[PDB]
Homo-oligomer: A and B are copies of this chain.
Amino acid sequence: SSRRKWNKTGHAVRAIGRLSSLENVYIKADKQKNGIKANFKIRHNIEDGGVQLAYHYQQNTPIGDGPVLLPDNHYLSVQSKLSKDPNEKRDHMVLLEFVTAAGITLSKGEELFTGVVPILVELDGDVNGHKFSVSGEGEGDATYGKLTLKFICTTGKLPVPWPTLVTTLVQCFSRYPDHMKQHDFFKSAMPEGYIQERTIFFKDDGNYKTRAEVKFEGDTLVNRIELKGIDFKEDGNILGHKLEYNTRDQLTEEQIAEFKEAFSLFDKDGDGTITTKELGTVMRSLGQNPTEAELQDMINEVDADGDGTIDFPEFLTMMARKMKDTDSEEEIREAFRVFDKDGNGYISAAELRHVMTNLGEKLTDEEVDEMIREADIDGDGQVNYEEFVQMMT
């Protein structure tokens, strides 16, 4: 059938497409410059359709003279969410990002990143002679590869789209798993820092050239940037502001924080990854005693990088994944049965307290009572299955 032929051919051509949209940041050593180089491409959606490609070429070199770590080839995987602050009248961008290194199979500088670190970002820009400045502030938590920042245009209206400045506006906050610690150039250059340079080519339009110094200034990690843009088209997608601001309709920041809180219950040592030991501990606390081999089988089924642990993005993938309605309903049934330890059909305050304390939460009886109250539609002091379903929905 001609329709059969079109389908099978279309699938093949689309498969080529899915394979070659490499979204990752590919890093390799630049031994001559005692640093690293990277290349990657960003796909900016165009309002009302189409994509604007931005080809990135990157080089980093240390600012100071102490030895640094030069890596084997690897990549960073980035998930970014852009949003707006409803009360902010200035031109602005709120950003949440998670970045994790991978691609390799299983000190001083590192130690500076074990907790939450305040960030300042300053950019001075000139695009086609339009001068502008951006200031940003927020925090990074490398344990999770997490960045949270807000940026403001301090010169009025930004003359380019905010998404085009994301990559310019601190790869030292990437999570490198334990087996790749010796490949983390960025933290190895700290505190003295590194210079990051890029050229960014917007296809069929102009380019940005950037130079940044990234370093500690006391206890703050500061990214100070100069940007020059040339050859842009006045009514192209960049100077003409034709790019979409955010992706429809990425899972909410709130939901991410809820998942992070949940993840923390498993990651007992706060190292940003769940091990078989940690998963066993949680399961034991709730009365289930799988063997070490069974725990490893469990983790493997969701361990996308084969490092044998579950990191936060891997946990998010597992939790974000599409379930058939029947399956979602049964998963909620099963969760109810975990809470309802005596199997009588009602979750009591005692039972709730037991589950939360065993997971490792610290709640008073009064806090547990308030949780029951929020769910207890019929006022009997316990949470039945219908009430539980509404709470989880």
Contact = CB atoms under 8 A, between A and B. Distances in A.
Contact of A6 (B3, B322, B371): B371
Contacts of A3: 374, 391
Interface string A91-108: 000000000000101000
A10 B387 CA distance: 13
Contacts of A85: none
A300 B359 contact: no
A160 interface: no
Contact of A302 (B19, B299, B326): B19
A157 interface: no
Nearest to A250: B324
Interface string A297-327: 1111110101000000001001100101110
A371 B49 contact: no
A370 interface: yes
A103 B300 contact: yes
Contacts of A294: 22
A117 interface: no
A102 to B, nearest CB: 9
A331 B105 CA distance: 31
A322 B361 CA distance: 35
A335 B259 contact: no
B18 A50 contact: no
Interface residues of A, number: 82
A201 interface: no
Contacts of A20: 283, 288, 290, 298
A45, A75, A392 interface centre (most CB from chain B within 10 Å): A392
A262 B17 contact: no
Nearest to A260: B8
A8 B374 contact: no
B359 A12 contact: yes
A373 B247 CA distance: 37
A181 B373 CA distance: 59
Contacts of A326: 45, 49, 248
A371 B5 contact: yes
A111 interface: no
A180 interface: no
Contact of A334 (B17, B338, B339): B17
A50 B333 contact: yes
Given A2-B373, A49-B329, A375-B6, A13 B301 contact: no
Contact of A283 (B10, B16, B45, B324): B16
B286 A16 contact: yes
A38 interface: no
B283 A50 contact: no
Contacts of A8: 258, 261-262, 265
Interface in A67-117: 75, 103, 105
Nearest to A391: B6
A282 interface: yes
B50 A330 contact: yes
Nearest to A43: B330
Given A6-B371, A26-B297, A290-B20, A15 B333 contact: no
Contact of A13 (B4, B339, B367): B339
A9 B319 contact: no
A179 interface: no
Interface of A: 2-20, 22-24, 26, 45, 49-51, 75, 103, 105, 247-248, 258-259, 261-262, 265-266, 279, 282-283, 286, 288, 290, 294, 297-302, 304, 306, 315, 318-319, 322, 324-326, 329-335, 338-339, 355-356, 359, 361, 363, 367, 370-371, 373-375, 391-392
